[PDB]
Design a protein around this ligand. Structure first.
Ligand SMILES: [Zn+2]
Lengths: 260, 6
């Protein structure tokens, strides 16, 4: 149990990167946090939804509005373009994202695993159907709601006027198709994650990536197998010292360099 | 283990 610190040698990393046949890129929020008086993690829970579906929908309406307008940043683009370029060489890049904003998709990434769902899908709490939804606003009663300042008045929308299911004989209440804290991730998605992690020969962990479980154990699983992991993050994390490399800085700076 | 948490 040597005091193992990660390398910051970019040239050594790029040596691995030139040879790698299957690169797994794990990403997080760099793309709690607070909306009004609440920690984001405390809205993103089925108990918040069961007990105040209006407050949760006002929050996800906000998130949909804010994120729906965002363009991909230099990190997303570099990751997308690295996938295309390596693709033409018979080399695999896959992104496993903890994010729900779809910005990897907007940047053109094709091999993408969204492990916590999407702002832009709903699921019906009655019949269970999942559907895409980019409609702004998602229902009329949320029009102009969702403002983030502490002190902003609650909408208090009656449940009947919240987003509703359009399937025949249904009209049930919709929720965001987002995996919430205390909910299980999709078992089929976790088995696919396992297969990518077991076969990759290089893993990057970006934006980080290391405080939401089980996703937080993904890169360390890869390193515990002896495969190199490079972490790109503005600060160090509880997992850093498990990895082969650590590149500090905003990843709109480092990632483009590392992936070039 | 499959259960999302912080
Ligand atoms: Zn339904």
């Amino acid at each position: 149990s040597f005091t193992a610190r990660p390398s910051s040698s970019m040239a050594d990393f790029r040596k691995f990167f030139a040879k790698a046949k299957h690169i797994v890129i794990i990403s997080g929020a760099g793309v709690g946090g607070y909306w009004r008086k609440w920690q984001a993690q405390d809205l993103a829970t089925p108990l918040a939804f069961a007990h105040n579906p209006s407050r949760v929908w006002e929050f996800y309406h906000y998130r949909r509005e804010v994120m729906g307008s965002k363009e991909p940043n230099a990190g997303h683009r570099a990751i997308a373009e690295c996938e295309t370029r390596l693709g033409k060489q018979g080399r695999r890049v896959v992104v496993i994202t903890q994010n729900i904003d779809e910005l990897h998709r907007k940047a053109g990434t094709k091999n993408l695993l969204e492990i916590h769902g999407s702002l832009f899908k709903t699921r019906c709490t009655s019949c269970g159907v999942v559907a895409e939804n980019y409609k702004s606003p998602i229902c009329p009663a949320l029009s102009g709601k969702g403002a983030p300042e502490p002190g902003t008045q609650d909408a208090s929308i009656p449940v009947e006027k919240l987003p509703r299911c359009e399937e025949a004989g249904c009209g049930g209440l919709l929720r965001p198709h987002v995996v919430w804290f205390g909910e299980n991730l999709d078992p089929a998605i976790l088995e696919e994650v396992d297969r990518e992690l077991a076969h990759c020969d290089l893993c990057l962990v970006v934006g980080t990536s290391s405080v939401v479980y089980p996703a937080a154990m993904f890169a360390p699983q890869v390193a515990a197998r002896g495969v190199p992991v490079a972490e790109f993050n503005t600060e160090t994390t509880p997992a850093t010292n498990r990895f082969r490399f650590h590149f500090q800085g905003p990843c709109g700076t480092t990632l483009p360099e590392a992936l070039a | 283990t499959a259960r999302k948490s912080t």
